[PDB]
Amino acid sequence: TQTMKGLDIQKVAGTWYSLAMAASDISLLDAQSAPARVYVEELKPTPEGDLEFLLQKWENGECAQKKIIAEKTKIPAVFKIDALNENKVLVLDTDYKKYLLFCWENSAQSLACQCLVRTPEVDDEALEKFDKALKALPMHIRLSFNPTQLEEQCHI
Amino acid sequence: GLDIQKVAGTWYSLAMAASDISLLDAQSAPARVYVEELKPTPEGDLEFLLQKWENGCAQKKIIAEKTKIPAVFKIDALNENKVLVLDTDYKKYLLFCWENSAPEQSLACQCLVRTPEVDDEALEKFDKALKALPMHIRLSFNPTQLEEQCHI
């Protein structure tokens, strides 16, 4: 999986909306509570060059929040979220101002990718770049959300 | 022009898409139905033999009655539910949609193939047909899922 060259995380800070999602396996995304059914609400880079994700997910009939710190690695658009180097964040592309494409990757191979946007509207260009970036990847499910869902907790 | 005799026989649901996530987001979801067989009738109707996952595979026959429009079939007498055949080469793939027009229109489309194998060309024709439709969920099956009927 190829990641962005020359990513500056200082330019990704702020609130985001998970516009579309895709995964290598149906059961990662299909259920409301599926393991990869996670909604990115905010990105916060640290001075150290780590990337904090503020996430929402449906559990046990309620929307829950979690902060995940993705730690910098030797590769500038690749972050680790465990000590065992099993789970990674891969940033594929961003124009900073409108959209950001990234994947969760687990190499115990599971892949769940998202198209994030800065404003809670459909961006056809962002969706097109998302689809193009996914062309090389073995995705078996894709989901996209309407503007109304983008503004509700857990995209209800 | 669609020839319903040539669409007869065994099929496999390779991929599915729908206008609404909740139509396809569980084995239990209303549009999560797998096509096993198409049978044309002498009267020019099209029988869909389906399987649906229920409490861990149940079989269902639905008759799609011919209309005055070719490749458009009605499932009920209230003209609420329709089958639209989008495209087929008879021997490899068939694309179709369930449609319902009862406050928002529902659409659920499939790519059927003649053998339980991934067909990248058929999946590409399906992807092209869906570009003009407002689909919010899409999923495709691997050869294991193709052979295991309703089980994925």
Ligand SMILES: CNCCCN1c2ccccc2CCc2ccccc21
């Ligand atoms: C079956 N439990 C799934 C894990 C829950 N999860 C949450 C919880 C709330 C919001 C986001 C997430 C995503 C990932 C994560 C990370 C760390 C602990 C729990 C969770």
Ligand SMILES: CNCCCN1c2ccccc2CCc2ccccc21
């Ligand atoms: C497989 N690890 C936990 C499952 C959910 N998860 C995914 C999903 C697909 C690919 C990788 C990962 C890595 C960790 C992670 C982090 C936050 C949400 C979901 C997930």
Ligand SMILES: CNCCCN1c2ccccc2CCc2ccccc21
């Ligand atoms: C492996 N590439 C799949 C080809 C297109 N495909 C996509 C595309 C992007 C994300 C997910 C999927 C899942 C399967 C699917 C189902 C129906 C049409 C296209 C696709």
Ligand SMILES: CNCCCN1c2ccccc2CCc2ccccc21
């Ligand atoms: C009784 N089932 C009604 C809904 C499921 N359904 C759908 C789904 C989406 C769009 C149209 C339809 C038409 C009816 C029908 C026929 C066969 C399988 C599913 C469905």
Ligand SMILES: [Cl-]
């Ligand atoms: Cl989608």
